[PDB]
Amino acid sequence: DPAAALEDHKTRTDNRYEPSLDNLAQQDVAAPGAPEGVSALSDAQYNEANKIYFERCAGCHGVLRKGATGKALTPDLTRDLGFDYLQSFITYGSPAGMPNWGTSGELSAEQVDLMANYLLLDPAAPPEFGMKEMRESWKVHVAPEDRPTQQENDWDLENLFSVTLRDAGQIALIDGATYEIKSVLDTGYAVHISRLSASGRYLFVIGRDGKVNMIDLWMKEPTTVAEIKIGSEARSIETSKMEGWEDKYAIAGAYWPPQYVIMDGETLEPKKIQSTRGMTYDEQEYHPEPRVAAILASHYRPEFIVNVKETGKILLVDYTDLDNLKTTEISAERFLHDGGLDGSHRYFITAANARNKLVVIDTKEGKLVAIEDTGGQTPHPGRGANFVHPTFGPVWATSHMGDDSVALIGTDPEGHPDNAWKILDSFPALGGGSLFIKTHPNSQYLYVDATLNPEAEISGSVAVFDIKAMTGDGSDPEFKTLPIAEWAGITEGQPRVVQGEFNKDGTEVWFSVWNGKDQESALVVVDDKTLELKHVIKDERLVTPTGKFNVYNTMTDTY
Amino acid sequence: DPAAALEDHKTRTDNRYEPSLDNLAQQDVAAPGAPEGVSALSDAQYNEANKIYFERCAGCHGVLRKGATGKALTPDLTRDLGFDYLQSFITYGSPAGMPNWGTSGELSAEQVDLMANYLLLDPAAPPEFGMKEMRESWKVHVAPEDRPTQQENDWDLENLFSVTLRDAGQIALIDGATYEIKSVLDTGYAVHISRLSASGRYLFVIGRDGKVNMIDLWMKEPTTVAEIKIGSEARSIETSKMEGWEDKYAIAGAYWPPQYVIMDGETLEPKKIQSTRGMTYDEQEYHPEPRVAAILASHYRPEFIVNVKETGKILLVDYTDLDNLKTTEISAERFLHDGGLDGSHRYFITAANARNKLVVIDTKEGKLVAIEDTGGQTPHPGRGANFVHPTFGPVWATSHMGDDSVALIGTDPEGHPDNAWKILDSFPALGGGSLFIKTHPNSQYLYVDATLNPEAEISGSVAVFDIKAMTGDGSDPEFKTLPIAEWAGITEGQPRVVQGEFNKDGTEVWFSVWNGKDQESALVVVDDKTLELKHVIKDERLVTPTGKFNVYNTMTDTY
Ligand code: DHE
Ligand code: DHE
Ligand code: HEC
Ligand code: HEC
C-alpha cells in the first residue's frame, strides 16, 4: 500500500538529522540507458532527478541506493514495485531536513515523476576521490618554516571561540572574555566542526564539501596556512592527542567516498587513505556505503577512534606506523554517530542512535566493554556531559532527539563497580528534539537544549539541572528553563537555540540562537554562577551561527 | 593502434596463470540499457559476451573492469576508444589460459563483435555472498561429538598424500609408502589445494567455486564431516598454526566477492567475513576488486597471513579475538600471489609476480623487511624451496613462469647478515613456464618443473640441481633432466609434469603427469637418493591429477 508513506515518510523530531548530500548533488551526471520495459530520462531530466535524490533522499537511502536508515531502493526492487507505486508513494512527501537550510520534503508533480523514473534506472557510483585528487587540491599557503616560532598576536588563544557561520561558509574567531569578533574567516562551503591541535596552535575546520582548512593561531592575523579536499561529502575531523604526538597528525572522515584520511598535522599532506566499505558487524553482509561519523583521538594510545555508521564498527587506528598499519576493528552496533570520552579519557561512549544504544569502548585495552539501551528514543549526545553525580559517582549523560529524556551511564568500573556501564537514571528535560547536553568541571549545572522541538517556546529555551541537588531516589530532578532566544531579542522567523559551549574557566556558557541566512541570529552568553544573561553577541556578519568551540575545552577534551 | 595486441594480447609463458572465473561465468546476468551513442545487446548476446568475458578476460581486466594486470576497461574509457578500435584489437584474440582446461583465446568474428559491444556497456557487479548465504550452504554432516576421539583406521596419516583429481571434482588419499589409493572422495569441482590442520587430523579442501570440504582423517572411513560455500570464485584456504591454536580455525580466501572468511576449525561455522575492497598501497586509489591470493599461517603469533593482490597489501589477521579484530595491513607490492615461510618459519617471502619482485615480511615484528627484484620474469614459487646453500647459508628459492631462471634469496639476518634479503644467485633450469620448485631437509636436490613450456619434451621433464655441488661462484650450476612424462609411459597427447611434493621422510618426491580429462594421466614417484624412477601410479580413478599434498609436510610447513 502506497499510503504507508504517511507514516514512513512523516517528519519527526528524530528523523531530520540524516545527511543531505548537497555538495555531491552539484556534480552533473549523464543519463544511463534504460533496459527493456523501462522508459529513459533525458540527460537534463536525469540530472534534475539526481540532484533532488542526493539532496533529499540519499541521506536515508544511500547515494548507491543500498539503504541506510531507510531500505534499499535499487532497480531490482523498484522495478518490481513499478512506476505507479513509486509515483504514489513519493507524492505524499519525504521527511524534512534540518531547520533553516534543510529541505521541506515536498515535490511538484513534474518532480515526483522524475524521481519515480530515476529510481527505475541504474545509478552509476559517484566518482571516487583518491590520493591523486587530494594532492591536486592540496595547497600549502604558508610553509611551516615560514610561520611564526611564537604567538605573534596578543590574543588569549585558550579562551577563544571558533564559531561556525554555517550558510556563509565562514567561521568567527570570538574573544571569550570581551566577546569581540576578532576575525571572520572564509573557507568557501559550510563548516561542520572546528577542532584544535593538542598544542592549541592549529585550528582545523572541515567543510561539508570535504574541504579542510588549517589555520595558524600564532600569526598576527590568523588565516589558513594549508588546505586540502578529502572527499565530496564530509562531516568529521580530529587531531592527534596522545602525549608525545602533539601536532603530528590530523584525520578527516567522509560520507562519500566512504573513507577516512590521515594527514600531516603541520602541512595537511595526505598520508594514508582507508576505505570504510566492508561488512556489517551483525548480519555480516557487504555494505557499499559505510559513512564515517564521529572521529575522536585516544589519550591512552597513539590512535584515532573512528565511527563507521552503517556497518557498526569502531576503528582504533594506530598512527605510529602508516605503512605497517595496525588497526582494531571493533564490532559494536549499527548506526554509530556521535560520542565522547568519559571524564578519565579512557572510555569512548557513543550513540548507535537509530537503535537507541550507547556503546562503550575501552581505549586502553582496545575492546568493547558494554552496549546499553538508554530507554529513550534516538540518543544524540554530541560529545556528551561528564560529571560526578553526588550519589552515583562518575557518570556521562546524553539527551535524545526522539523524546525529552536525559540518561546517565556510570563510567567508573574500578571505583563504582555495580554502577559501571549501567543506565543509572533517566529523567525529562524541556521536550523532544534535543541535540546537545553540556557541563564543565567548574560548573554545578547540566544544560540541555531542545533545538528540533516543534514548539518555539521550547526550541528557543534551555533546561538547566543542578547536579549538586541530584539524589538518586529515582525521582525526577527539577530544572530551570532559560529563555535563551527571548534573551537575544529575536522573535522573527523561528530561531532555534543550539549547543552549549563553555569558556576556558567554565564560568560562562554560550548558546547559538540559530535563525535563517536572511534573518537575525545571535550568540547568548550565560553566567554559569547565576544562570542569568551576561551578554548578547549580534553582528550583521553573524549568519546562521551553529557550532561553537572553545580552544581550551576542545584541545583538552574537557566536557 | 590495434596491432599492439600482437605483444599484449598474445600468449606468453607467463601470462597463462591469471584467474579464469568459469564458475562465476555460469551465472546469468541482465542485459543493461545503452546510453546515447551506444547500441544495446540482447539478453542472449549480453550473456554470451559476459560468459566469454568472465572465463577469458576478467582475470586480467577484472569483472568490474577496473583493471588488474591489464588496464581498466570501464565504459568511459572504451567509449573514447570506440567500437572500431575495440573490434580491430579484439580480432587478434586473447592470451590462452592453462593447458588441459583453459581457453585457447581464439574468437570468431561474431564473438569479436559481441566483446567490443559488451565493453561499451555498463557492467553490473556480480552478487555478493555474505553470512546469510554461507550459513544456508553450511552443513555439518558429523557433529564433533559424534566423531572419534582417537584414530579409528589403521592408515599412516602423516605419510598420506591428498591428490586433486581436478576435472572429476574429487580428491584421492594415497598411501605414501605403498602407493595404494586408500579412498577417493567427492568434493568441489576442481579442488585447488589441500591443507591440513596443525594436528594433522583434519583435511581441508577448497574448490575453485568456493566450496570448502572438511574431512576427518580419524574416521574408520574418512569422509566430509562439514562443508560450506564461501564465495563464487576462490583459490585459497589455510589452518591455524600458532602453538596453542591447533585445530581452532580455518580461513578461506576468495576472488569474488573480494573477501576472506574465518571459520570454526571443527565445524566450519563462518565466524568472521572481511572485505578486501580498499586502496592500492602505492597510488592510494580505490580498487573495487582486490582478490585474495595465497593465505599462510604464522608460527610466531596467532595470525593468518593474507595476500591481497590488486592493492598490494599483506594482512596479518589476529584470530585471538574476532569481535575486537586486530589486523596489520602491510603496504607491500602490487600483484602479490604465492609465497612461503623461510626455514625458520619467521619470514614470509612472497611473489608480486607481475612486478618481478619478492616481498619479505617479518611475521614476528609484523613489518615489511624487504622488496627485491629477482632479475627474472614473473616469479612463481608456490611455497618455494628452503635449503642451506654451501656458500651462502640459508636461502629460499623460486623459479619463474616467464623465463628459465631460478633465483635465491638469503634468509638469515642473524647468521648471514650480508646475504639477508638479497638475490644471491640466478641460474637457468629447463626453460620458461616453470610453476613449482621443491626440496626437503633430508634431500640434497632441488627440483624445478617447466609445466607451461611450449615444448613437449621440456614440459614433460624436471630439472634437478645438486645443492651440495653449488658454489655460488657465478657460474651456472649443472642440472640432471628427469624424463618424468616418459617414465609414466603415456602414448596420447602431451602431458604436462607439475609440482614436486615429498613424502614425510623426504626420501621420495612425487610429480603429477597431467593429461586431459578423457586422456591418460599418472603420478610418478622418484627415489630422491638416486634420482631414479621408484613407482608409476596409474588408476582409472586418477583423472587429471594436479596438486598433491603430503599430510606431514603440509601441516608443518616443511618446504
Ligand atoms: C558526523 C557528524 C558529527 C560528528 C563530528 C565529529 O566527531 O567531528 C556532527 C557533529 C556536529 C556538531 C558537534 C558538536 C560538538 O560539541 O562536538 C555540531 C555543533 C553539529 C551541528 C549541526 N549538524 Fe552535525 N550533521 C551531520 C553529521 C555530523 N554532525 C549530518 O549528516 C547532518 C545531520 C546533515 C548534514 O548534511 O550535514 C548534520 C547537521 C547539522 C546541523 O544542521 C547542525 C545543527 C548545524 C550545522 O552547522 O550544520 N554537528
Ligand atoms: C591463489 C592461488 C594459489 C595459492 C593457494 C593457497 O595459498 O592456499 C594457488 C596455488 C596452487 C597450488 C599450490 C601448490 C603448493 O605446493 O602450495 C597448486 C598445486 C595449484 C595448481 C594449479 N593452479 Fe593455482 N591457480 C590460481 C590461483 C592460485 N593457485 C589461478 O587464479 C589460476 C591461475 C587459475 C584459476 O582460475 O584457477 C590457477 C591455476 C592452477 C592450475 O591450472 C593448477 C596448475 C591445477 C589445478 O588443479 O587447477 N595452484
Ligand atoms: C529518512 C528519514 C528518509 C528520507 C529523507 C526519505 N525516506 Fe524513503 N523511506 C524511509 C523509511 C524509514 C522508509 C520505510 C521502509 C524502511 O526502510 O523502514 C522509506 C520508504 C521509501 C520507499 C518505499 C519502498 C518500498 O519497498 O516500499 C520509497 C519508494 C522511498 N522511501 C523513496 C524515497 C524518496 C524518493 C525520498 C526522497 C524524496 C525519500 N524516500 C526520502 C526513510 C526516508
Ligand atoms: C592477461 C593476460 C589478458 C587477458 C586474458 C586479456 N587481456 Fe586485454 N589486455 C591485457 C594487456 C596487458 C593489455 C595492454 C594494456 C596494459 O594493461 O598494459 C590489454 C589491453 C586490452 C584492450 C585495449 C585497451 C586500450 O586502452 O587500448 C582491450 C580492448 C582488451 N585488452 C580487451 C580484452 C578482452 C575483450 C579480453 C578477453 C577476450 C582480454 N582483453 C583478455 C591483458 C589481458
Swiss-Prot record, chains A, B:
It is found in: Periplasm. Residues 126-559 are annotated as: D1-heme domain. Residues 1-39 are annotated as: N-terminal tail. Residues 40-125 form the Cytochrome c domain. It comes from the Bacteria. Heme d1 binds at Y17, S20, W101, R166, H192, R195, R208, R235, Y255, R383, Q499, T546. Its cofactor is heme c; heme. CDD domains: 8prop_hemeD1_NirS (cd20779). GO terms for molecular function: electron transfer activity; heme binding; hydroxylamine reductase activity; metal ion binding; nitrite reductase (NO-forming) activity. InterPro entries: Cyt_c-like_dom (IPR009056), Cyt_c-like_dom_sf (IPR036909), Cyt_cd1_C_sf (IPR003143), Haem_d1_sf (IPR011048). It is an enzyme of class 1 (oxidoreductase). Keywords: Electron transport, Heme, Iron, Metal-binding, Oxidoreductase, Periplasm, Signal, Transport. PROSITE patterns: CYTC. Its EC number is 1.7.2.1, 1.7.99.1. Heme c binds at H9, C57, C60, H61, K71, Y85. It catalyses: nitric oxide + Fe(III)-[cytochrome c] + H2O = Fe(II)-[cytochrome c] + nitrite + 2 H(+); A + NH4(+) + H2O = hydroxylamine + AH2 + H(+). Binds 1 heme c group covalently per subunit. One of its GO terms (cellular component) is periplasmic space. SUPFAM superfamilies: C-terminal (heme d1) domain of cytochrome cd1-nitrite reductase, Cytochrome c. Homodimer. This is Nitrite reductase. The lineage of its organism: Bacteria, Pseudomonadati, Pseudomonadota, Alphaproteobacteria, Rhodobacterales. The gene is nirS.
